[PDB]
Write a protein that binds this DNA or RNA. Structure first.
Ligand SMILES: Nc1nc2c(ncn2[C@@H]2O[C@H](COP(=O)(O)CP(=O)(O)OP(=O)(O)O)[C@@H](O)[C@H]2O)c(=O)[nH]1
Ligand SMILES: [Mg+2]
Ligand SMILES: [Zn+2]
Ligand SMILES: [Zn+2]
Ligand SMILES: [Zn+2]
Lengths: 101, 59, 601, 176, 179, 47, 57, 100, 115
DNA sequence: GTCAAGTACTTACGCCTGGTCATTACTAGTACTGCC
DNA sequence: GGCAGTACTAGTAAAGAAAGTACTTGAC
RNA sequence: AGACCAGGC
């Protein structure tokens, strides 16, 4: 309660096959569609992957490309998300493997 | 919408699907509506009754 | 944390690895290239350290996810370092394998049957086989007919030892790793590196390699191979070397000797079967952090860019200098004589910049702090923001003594009784007392300050009148008009009452009884916490200006612990000696001498 | 083309269904699942059948009524694995379906499938040798090569399936 | 991370084992105050019987087994233990390592068994002799340490806080603890 | 000496099972001592 | 540059003086009291080098 | 459907191997001070979220006081899963565990 | 307890550019609620009781054409004792841009105060 | 192989409250003015 | 009337008094 | 957010 729940509680979305806190991001949907959470590392460019019309998502750049929809939210402290940003600045890859896969 | 209160956390297919004929569907739809009336899926029951009456009759 | 917003998955483990450069070109949002942070009229220039592709910045939507400042998580980008440069975290371990390796056959300078002896001892230590790794020395100028046969007997002994222990209920295929097998693994790798570095000739093909000189960081020097032992190079049938050449050597060493370094660089068995590469010691691409985590130092008009932007600007300035230095090699003797002596000068300064970004003390140059020094000491990241944290829902004020308090209570002021609040979800048994709590409003004790709806929405009661506030009290227990929120109920942030729990705490908390759990009894007059005298022996708290903290827990799992488990009635006996710490102190002891006297009638 | 998938799904359980665990997994997770497209199933879930909650202790039997649900430490909700047989209507490309006519327009023939699911056959999917006559009064009809109005059924090959929006839509072509 | 496990065997957080039993007897310091205060507990027998309640707790316990082996090792050790420790062909574990003391009534330590029978021999004194030893053995069992006690924190605060009772030709005090 | 134990952890490719109370506060788990030394299960009545 | 020395206490010297410390030469005269105010003009200090030092003598 | 089925049968076989049977369990027959603090806590979160209450309310408005009342008549439908350091566990219901 | 803060209106510009912020009220529809604390020149009256949220000075702006007030950023109520007008010294004569306001706070000895 | 000493990096009580100051040289440019 | 000298201006570039281990280099 | 200074227990 003190060291997490009332200081920096956040429910951050985590890629299940990357184990990455700060890789995934919100997709930019079309009109009428709903946005989904999607990963950047285990994705693939659409020109590289030559599809099933639902795994294809798109950036805010208009960069439309198909890939990682294996993501979920886990409740972490927010300073862990800053710890990965400093370790990836060094070149350290923390992998957060979640239990329901 | 799109919460752990609504959606499953993880969803997987346990076994490969195989097709069912018209007899298994009409036995399902006579049992699925029976076990459901006896909730905002009433708008979906209205679409289930269209399919149940389609394999039995004609609108 | 909302108890009405559960979370599904859980981090069970973590593990450490190195970003390869292929990942951080796929992970990346946008490669950033020019060393100008933001141009005139305050706009972040496209391709700079502040870019809209790396996150929403200062009332300007992100170019990757299209969200504003409040909802963009921040996105990573990268830069392209033109030369493979040293990672200063791994330079001490690179320099061991930079040495101790033959520059001619690209093995290490040991004999290849003794390097194999550690590969089969460290494979046993990946599994829980600390005993069988000493039985492997029992398997025991010299022709290669039997050394090829000795490597078969040591390898078949391991393949028989691993398969038996994995069937004799002892080791999973993920490998058993305990504390005392971490002892004999660190002991064996330190035996391995100390014996690699002490070699004269390569014991595979017998000739010398020119020794290396570590000037400090940022540089590397090969020394002069003497005239006495260039004869051995002729019977086999000083210079600053480039960082591109060191990677060329060590990519060849790690392929001729891949089968040993799978077990030196892995504690647990490598189930992914990935190669270990010498590119993993270098870094060819810097990862720029998201622009959320490097916002500028804003103080009125005194806007200074972050210290990481000042270090990453110098890496990009040097990266465009060397791009404009290699534009003369396409133009092409004096024009070649001076342009290469300044190109090799630019090789050192881009290494000296990638040092200063990661570590401010490995950078020759009051200096700007690096990524290492935001983590290290008190005022680091682990000690200042992970092991200790600033907290919400917590108070601190001076203490005054108070009898007529039932010795398991703290006397809370009205001004903490109004600000501190607790989320009660509404039920059939709260709508008696929690309908009156919302009607009383944020300033009447006992009252409430906010209503959390079923939807996660949150309605403040501060700027409201009593007629609007009686309408929300009848709307308080209503069935949901949404299917996706049908099992939830409203939470009323009531004020702290006479039934809540409180953690009291005086620094230094030298033992666990200096942080106890008290009941609360509000008092109507002044602004000080009020403590009974039996608690003063445990907190070591006189009343000459002591102030002590007050933490208010926000769920029923922590209310049940601070009433039953960390309770102040449970802490009568300290666990140091078993002697009590709670008891009456100064006036109550001199009174009992007079009250229990024979004269007292 | 209605097909049967057996699934294994990891759901929540609010404390109000701690006396009726089968009734709660249906109302929270399975009743919002009917008549919607689902990515990890293949098509549109018509209904479900045979819900079984995986008990948390393995020492018990499947005959027992009292089962165990693991409570989250922070929140009072319980998480569990469940087995249930979904029945799902999935269309795929290549297959030919009966189509009841819903809208006859000059650009997009919007028709129904099994009186529920919307579909579309564009004008470029219609070959050139068919004509559309006007309806100036109130939406006419397309004239085929037989010189007759098309009406009722229309067997067409599935060209593309568009599932990203609110409901599913089926793109239809008329070449075979 | 050092804590009592449900084995009554205190150990580190990763799983490695520091001791096999807390202090050799698995009893809490905040409960062993009146454990050997026998003449206090005899005068207050009928009032301590209301909080330990012996006959109501016979059902969920094993009373028969641990008391037999506590007599097969007490009688064995009084016959021996004239010779020193290296000569002792021991042949019998202590009863506290063979039986779980939180479950078996009568699995006590040896100096609790030796001090009980020394009290129960010197002064012989309406409570009889067998009701008094059957209440100290349930008081010992209730004075067991609970599994989950963060012991290594308690053991580190039991040194660092009394070290601040020193402040605030042999070396002595806080420089001795530094060494 | 954080980034000396950091380099030794990444050159071992060391996986840690989040056992120490220090490792569970960094990643945000419930602590394995005292109250978090067990789970709590709920007996639901129906199948 | 003399207003900077008084406002901060930092000693900026190209040929550093015979002093061990480099900062903390000026102190705000409080006037929080007259006992406080007259005590600023009678105080001696050994140096800030000796403060960050774990000796007693 | 083939990788997950084999992964599910390994996830449910090891968790059966860790399950110590009811006749072969060896921990204490008492509900410890930590198990009492979490039984009263996890139940009081459920009472506050409209779980069915098995005891008559005598005008109690505090969810933690209701949880203390349900423990006195042993009406709490919760189970303690006591983990061993092997990863194995026992299962103790609240009606089995005797207090103090 | 006496507490003095300097209200400086000329710290966001340089080198003779025209002053965009003038003390006093403007011609816009600014609320008549703060005639009570403030005088016609955008300065507060002497002796007025000021709790948190009350304005301490009014100034008209030119790049926004709106009268903004600076407010009392302290949760302990005070009384305004004196208002100085710190005129700038220059060869060209300038409209006022710096005003020093002094507060007084009644510290009646409450309990918890050290004697 | 070897002990050997010099060198290099490493920590050094907890919490809390105020207050202040904070880039400098210079260098090229546009404008001001004295001039014939 | 317009030329060139200065005085400024805003502009963009450089900034000597604690105790422990681990390690290489070091004679022999 | 830092550095320095002045303090509280
Ligand atoms: N952890 C720290 N605690 C401190 C420090 N300085 C003071 N203190 C606390 O402040 C208190 C200071 O007590 P005093 O210096 O007044 C000794 P005193 O004779 O006045 O005690 P009494 O006779 O009980 O009045 C003491 O309880 C300490 O716990 C410090 O530097 N660190
Ligand atoms: Mg004091
Ligand atoms: Zn991924
Ligand atoms: Zn974004
Ligand atoms: Zn060689």
């Amino acid at each position: 309660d003190r060291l997490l729940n009332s200081s920096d509680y956040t429910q951050a979305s985590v890629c299940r096959e990357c184990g990455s806190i700060l890789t995934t991001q919100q997709s930019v949907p079309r009109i009428g569609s709903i946005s989904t959470v999607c990963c950047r590392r285990c994705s693939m460019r659409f020109e590289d992957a030559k599809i099933d019309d639902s795994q294809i998502w798109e950036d805010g750049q208009g960069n439309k490309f198909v890939g990682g929809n294996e993501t979920t939210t886990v409740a972490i402290p927010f300073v862990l998300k800053y710890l990965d940003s400093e370790l990836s600045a060094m070149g350290i890859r923390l992998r957060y493997n979640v239990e329901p896969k | 919408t799109a919460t752990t209160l609504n959606t499953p956390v993880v969803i997987h297919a346990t076994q490969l699907p195989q097709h069912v004929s018209t007899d298994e569907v009409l036995q399902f739809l006579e049992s699925f509506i029976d076990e459901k009336e006896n909730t905002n899926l009433s708008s979906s029951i209205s679409q289930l009754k269209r399919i149940q009456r389609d394999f039995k009759g004609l609108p | 944390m909302d108890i009405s917003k559960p979370v599904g998955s859980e981090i069970t483990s973590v593990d450490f690895g190195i970003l390869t450069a292929k990942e951080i070109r796929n992970l990346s949002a946008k490669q950033i290239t020019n060393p100008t942070v933001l141009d005139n009229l305050g706009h972040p220039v496209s391709g700079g350290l502040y870019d809209l592709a790396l996150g929403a910045f200062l009332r300007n939507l992100c170019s990757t996810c299209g969200l504003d400042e409040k909802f963009c998580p921040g996105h990573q980008g990268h830069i392209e370092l033109p030369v493979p440069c040293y990672n200063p975290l791994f330079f001490n371990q690179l320099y061991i394998y930079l040495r101790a390796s033959c520059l001619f056959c690209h093995h290490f300078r040991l004999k290849s049957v003794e390097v194999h002896r550690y590969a089969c001892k460290l494979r046993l230590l990946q599994y829980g086989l600390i005993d069988e790794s000493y039985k492997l020395d029992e398997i025991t100028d010299i022709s290669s007919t039997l050394l090829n046969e000795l490597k078969s007997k040591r390898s078949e002994y391991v393949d028989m030892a691993i398969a038996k222990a994995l069937s004799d209920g002892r080791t999973t295929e993920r490998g058993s790793f305990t504390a005392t097998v971490n002892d004999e693994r660190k002991k064996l790798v330190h035996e391995f590196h100390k014996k690699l570095l002490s070699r004269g000739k390569c014991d595979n093909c017998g000739m010398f390699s020119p020794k290396f000189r570590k000037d400090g960081f940022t540089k590397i020097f090969e020394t002069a191979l003497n005239e006495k032992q260039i004869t051995n190079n002729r019977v086999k049938g000083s210079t600053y070397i480039l960082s591109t050449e060191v990677k060329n050597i060590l990519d060849t060493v790690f392929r001729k000797e891949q089968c040993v370094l799978q077990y030196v660089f892995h504690s647990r068995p490598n189930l992914s079967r990935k190669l270990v590469k010498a590119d993993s010691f270098f870094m060819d691409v810097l990862v720029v952090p998201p622009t959320r985590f490097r916002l500028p130092s804003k103080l009125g008009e005194e806007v200074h860019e972050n210290s990481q932007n000042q270090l990453l600007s110098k890496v990009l300035t040097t990266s465009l200098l060397i791009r404009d230095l290699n534009d003369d090699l396409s133009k092409l003797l004096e024009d070649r004589r001076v342009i290469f002596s300044r190109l090799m000068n630019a090789f050192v300064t881009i290494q000296n910049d990638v040092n200063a970004f990661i570590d401010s003390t490995k950078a020759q140059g009051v200096p700007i702090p690096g990524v290492k020094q935001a983590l290290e000491k008190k005022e680091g990241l682990f000690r200042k923001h992970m092991m200790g944290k600033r907290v919400n829902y917590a108070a601190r004020s001076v203490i005054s003594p108070d009898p007529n308090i039932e010795t398991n209570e703290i006397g809370v002021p009205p001004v903490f009784a109004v600000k501190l609040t607790y989320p009660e979800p509404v039920t059939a048994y709260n709508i008696a007392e929690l309908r009156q709590a919302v009607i009383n409003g944020p300033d009447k004790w006992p009252g409430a300050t906010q209503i959390q709806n079923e939807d996660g929405s949150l309605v403040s009661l501060i700027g409201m009148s009593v007629e609007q506030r009686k309408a929300l009290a009848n709307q308080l227990l209503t069935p949901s008009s949404n299917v996706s929120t049908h099992t939830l109920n409203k939470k009323v942030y009531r004020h702290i009452k006479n039934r809540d729990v409180v953690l009291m705490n005086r620094q230094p908390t030298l033992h666990k009884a200096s942080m106890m759990g008290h009941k609360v009894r509000v008092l109507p007059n002044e602004k000080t916490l009020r403590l009974h005298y039996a608690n003063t022996g445990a907190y070591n708290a006189d009343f000459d200006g002591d102030e002590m903290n007050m933490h208010f827990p926000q769920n029923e799992n922590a209310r049940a612990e601070a009433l039953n488990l960390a309770n102040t009635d449970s802490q009568y006996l300290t666990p140091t000696s078993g002697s009590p710490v709670r008891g009456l102190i100064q006036d109550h002891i001199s009174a009992g001498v007079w009250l229990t006297s024979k004269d007292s009638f | 083309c209605i097909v049967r998938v057996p699934i294994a799904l990891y759901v929540s359980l609010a404390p109000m269904y701690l006396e009726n665990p089968l009734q709660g997994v249906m109302k929270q997770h399975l009743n919002p699942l009917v008549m919607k497209y689902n990515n990890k199933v293949g098509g549109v879930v018509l209904g479900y059948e045979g819900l079984k909650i995986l008990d948390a202790d393995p020492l018990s039997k499947e005959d027992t009524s009292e089962k165990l649900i693991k409570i989250t430490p922070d929140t009072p909700f319980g998480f569990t694995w469940c087995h249930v047989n979904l029945y799902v209507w999935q269309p795929q490309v290549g297959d030919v379906l009966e189509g009841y006519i819903f809208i006859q327009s000059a650009s997009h023939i919007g028709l129904l499938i099994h009186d529920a699911f919307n579909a579309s056959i564009k004008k470029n999917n219609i070959p050139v040798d068919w004509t559309f006559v006007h309806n100036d009064v109130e939406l006419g009809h397309w004239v085929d090569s037989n010189g007759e109005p098309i009406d009722g059924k229309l067997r067409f090959t599935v060209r593309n399936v568009h599932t990203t929006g609110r409901v599913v839509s089926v793109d239809g072509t008329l070449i075979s | 991370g050092v804590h009592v496990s449900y084995d009554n065997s205190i150990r580190d957080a990763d799983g490695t084992l520091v001791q096999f039993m807390y202090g050799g007897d698995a009893i809490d310091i905040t409960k062993e105050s009146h454990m050997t205060q026998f003449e206090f507990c005899l005068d207050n027998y009928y009032a301590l019987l209301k909080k330990y309640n012996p006959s109501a707790l016979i059902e969920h316990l094993d009373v028969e087994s641990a008391l037999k082996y506590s007599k097969k090792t007490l009688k064995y050790r009084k016959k021996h233990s004239k010779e020193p420790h290296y000569k002792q062909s021991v042949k019998y574990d202590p009863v506290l390592a063979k039986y779980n003391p939180a479950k078996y009534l009568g699995s006590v330590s040896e100096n609790f068994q030796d001090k009980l029978e020394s009290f129960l021999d010197k002064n012989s004194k309406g409570v009889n002799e067998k009701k008094f030893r059957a209440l100290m053995q349930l008081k010992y069992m209730r004075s067991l340490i609970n599994p989950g006690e963060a012991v290594g924190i308690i053991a580190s605060q039991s040194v660092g806080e009394p070290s601040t009772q020193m402040t605030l030709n042999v070396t002595l005090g806080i420089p001795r603890l530094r060494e | 000496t954080t980034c000396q134990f950091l380099t030794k952890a990444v050159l071992d490719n060391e996986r840690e099972q989040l056992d120490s109370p220090s490792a569970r506060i960094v990643v945000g788990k419930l602590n394995n001592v005292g109250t978090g030394s067990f789970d709590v299960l709920a007996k639901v009545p129906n199948a | 540059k003399m207003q900077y020395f008084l406002s901060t206490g930092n000693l900026v010297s190209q040929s550093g003086l015979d002093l061990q410390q480099v900062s903390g030469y000026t102190v705000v005269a409080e006037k929080i009291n007259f006992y406080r105010f007259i005590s600023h003009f009678r105080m001696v200090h050994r140096g800030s080098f000796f403060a960050q030092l774990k000796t007693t003598t | 459907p083939e990788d997950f089925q084999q992964h599910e049968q390994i996830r449910r076989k090891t968790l059966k191997e860790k399950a110590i049977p009811k006749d072969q369990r060896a921990t204490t027959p008492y509900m410890t001070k930590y198990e009492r603090a979490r039984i009263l806590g996890t139940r009081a979160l459920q009472i506050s979220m409209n779980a069915p209450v098995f005891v008559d309310l005598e005008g109690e408005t505090d969810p933690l006081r209701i949880a203390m009342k349900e423990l006195a008549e042993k009406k709490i439908p919760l189970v303690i899963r006591r983990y061993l350091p092997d990863g194995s566990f026992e299962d103790w219901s609240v009606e089995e565990l005797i207090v103090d | 307890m006496y507490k003095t803060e300097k209200v400086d209106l000329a710290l966001n510009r340089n080198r003779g550019d025209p002053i965009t912020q003038h003390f006093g009220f403007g011609n816009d529809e600014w609320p008549k609620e703060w005639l009570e604390k403030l005088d016609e020149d955008g300065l507060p009256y002497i002796g007025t009781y000021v709790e948190e949220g009350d304005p301490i000075c009014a100034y008209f702006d030119d790049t926004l054409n709106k009268t903004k007030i600076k407010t009392y950023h302290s949760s302990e109520p005070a009384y305004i004792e004196e208002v100085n007008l710190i005129g700038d010294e220059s060869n060209k004569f300038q409209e006022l841009q710096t005003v020093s306001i002094k507060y007084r706070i009644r510290r009646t000895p409450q309990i918890g105060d050290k004697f």
